[PDB]
């Protein structure tokens, strides 16, 4: 059932301490979609932190506000310092991708994963498709595992940058 799916690998194998899919195996696809979603957002967030450490874009963030890309710090302060119009455009783009471009759920309120699709197969036709079954399974496992490590790491960076103001903790 659930014990042999993409994610039941690594040192722990199948890992359900609080028996979620054991109690409700029907919800495993929804949980996989959510895990892929959070993992991917966290991969992006961790790379954003690590790369904002050393590389910054050129030019002004907002010429009317006289806010420059290099002037921003690296952390939550940068998102604070983005102008309100920038934040609104950011939310608009994220919402467009969430609702229309890459739809994680099909419909109603308690969204189910799409019918003729994997738990998190949100890309359209123009996307890398692996046809070797072994490579497909291996790389999907790599996707979800890197996502998990990324969300643990990103929570770490967020807490460090909340406590101190820098994602790098001293040491």
Partner 1 sequence: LAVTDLVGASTEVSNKVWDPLKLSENMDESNLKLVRAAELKHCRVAMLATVGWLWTATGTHFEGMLSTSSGVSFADVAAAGPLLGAAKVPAAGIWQMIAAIGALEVYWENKYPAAECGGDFGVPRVTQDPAKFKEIQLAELKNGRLAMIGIISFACAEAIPGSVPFYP
Ligand X SMILES: CC1=C(C#C/C(C)=C/C=C/C(C)=C/C=C/C=C(C)/C=C/C=C(C)/C=C/[C@@]23O[C@]2(C)C[C@@H](O)CC3(C)C)C(C)(C)C[C@H](O)C1
- Provide, rounded to whole angstroms, the least separation between the CB of residue 53 and partner 1: 8
Confirm or reject binding of residue 149 to ligand X (CB under 6 A).
yes
d(CA 75, CA 49): 7
Cα dihedral: 102, 143, 113, 109 (round 10): -70
Residue among 26, 128, 133, 163 that touches partner 1 (CB under 8 A)? 128
d(CA 147, CA 7): 11
Stretch that binds ligand A1EB1, among 18-26, 65-73, 90-98, 153-161 (CB under 6 A): 153-161
The listed partner (partner 1, ligand X, ligand CLA, none) that binds 11, CB under 5 to 8 Å by sort, is ligand X
Cβ contact 60:69 at 8 Å = yes
62 phi and psi angles, rounded to 5 deg: -145, 110
148 marked as part of a ligand binding site: yes
- Provide, rounded to whole angstroms, the least separation between the CB of residue 88 and ligand CLA: 27
Residue among 24, 32, 50, 93 that touches ligand CLA (CB under 6 A)? 32
Residue among 36, 43, 72, 140 that touches ligand A1EB1 (CB under 6 A)? 43
DSSP conformation letters of 72-124 = S-SSHHHHHHS-HHHHHHHHHHHHHIIIIIS-SS-SSSSPPPPTTS-TT----
User: 3: which 2 tokens?
Assistant: 């014990």
Cβ contact 58:165 at 8 Å = no
Confirm or reject binding of residue 127 to ligand A1EB1 (CB under 6 A).
yes
Residue among 1, 12, 124, 126 that touches ligand X (CB under 6 A)? 12
Cβ contact 42:147 at 8 Å = yes
Confirm or reject binding of residue 145 to ligand X (CB under 6 A).
yes
21 marked as part of a ligand binding site: yes
Binding site for ligand X (CB under 6 A): 10-12, 145, 148-149, 152
Output the known binding site for chlorophyll a: 15, 21, 32, 35, 38, 143, 146, 148
């Amino acid at each position: 059932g659930v014990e042999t799916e993409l994610g039941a690998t690594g040192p722990l194998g199948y890992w359900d301490p609080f028996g979620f899919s054991v109690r409700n195996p029907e919800r495993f696809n929804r949980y996989r979609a959510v895990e892929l979603k959070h993992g991917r957002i966290a991969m992006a967030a961790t790379t954003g932190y690590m790369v904002q450490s050393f590389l910054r874009w050129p030019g002004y963030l907002s010429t009317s506000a006289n806010i420059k890309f290099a002037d921003l710090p690296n952390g939550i302060a940068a998102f604070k310092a983005i102008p309100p119009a920038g934040l609104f455009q950011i939310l608009l783009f994220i919402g467009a991708m969430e609702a229309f471009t890459w739809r994680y759920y099909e419909g109603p309120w308690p969204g189910k994963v799409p019918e003729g699709k994997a738990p998190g197969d949100v890309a359209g036709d123009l996307w890398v498709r692996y046809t070797d079954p072994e490579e497909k399974a291996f790389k999907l496992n790599a996707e979800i595992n890197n996502g998990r490590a990324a969300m643990m790491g990103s929570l770490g960076m967020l807490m460090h940058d909340h406590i101190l103001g820098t994602w790098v903790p001293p040491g």
